[PDB]
Design a protein around this ligand. Structure first.
Ligand SMILES: COc1cc2cc(c1OC)OCCCOC/C=C/CCOC(=O)[C@@H]1CCCCN1C(=O)[C@H]2C1CCCCC1
Length: 128
């Protein structure tokens, strides 16, 4: 599956180089411009546990998912990963618990120490 592919061939985009967030670009975006901290960000995504046991999509709710980058309205991995993307890019992320929900998890949706997979499309970003 996609999660294994990202383990095999994904780029480690962490500062600490701890393989806690791994990325493959699956479709290239446009521009050199990528979002700065505080940017308003628009994505479609689909997510699961790497176990495959719970699943989640923006599509499910009709409309795009919208958040302020680097304001921890998301897990740290998204702040990190999204910030590396271009308008129009789709990428795959594999995330260790430390850049997601940690040893406390987030029951019942997320268990302790969970690895997460996401597919993310970056639709747009506007400045605060
Ligand atoms: C742990 O809680 C949830 C996690 C996730 C989805 C959830 C959660 O219930 C609140 O509900 C469906 C979407 C509600 O949307 C606004 C909330 C974002 C919560 C913060 O979530 C995150 O930061 C990340 C990244 C942005 C998309 C949502 N994501 C999740 O981890 C998903 C999760 C993905 C893996 C399968 C289970 C759901």
């Amino acid at each position: 599956g996609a999660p294994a592919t990202v383990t095999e061939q994904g780029e480690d985009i962490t500062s600490k180089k701890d393989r806690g967030v791994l990325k493959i670009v699956k479709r290239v975006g446009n521009g050199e411009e990528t979002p700065m901290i505080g940017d308003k960000v628009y994505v479609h995504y689909k997510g699961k546990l790497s176990n495959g046991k719970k699943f989640d999509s923006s599509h499910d709710r009709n409309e795009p998912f919208v958040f302020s980058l680097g304001k921890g309205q998301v897990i740290k991995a998204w702040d990190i990963g999204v910030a590396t993307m271009k308008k129009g890019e789709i990428a795959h992320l594999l995330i260790k618990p430390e850049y997601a929900y940690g040893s406390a998890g987030s029951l019942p949706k997320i268990p302790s120490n969970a690895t997460l997979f996401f597919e993310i499309e970056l639709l747009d970003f506007k400045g605060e």
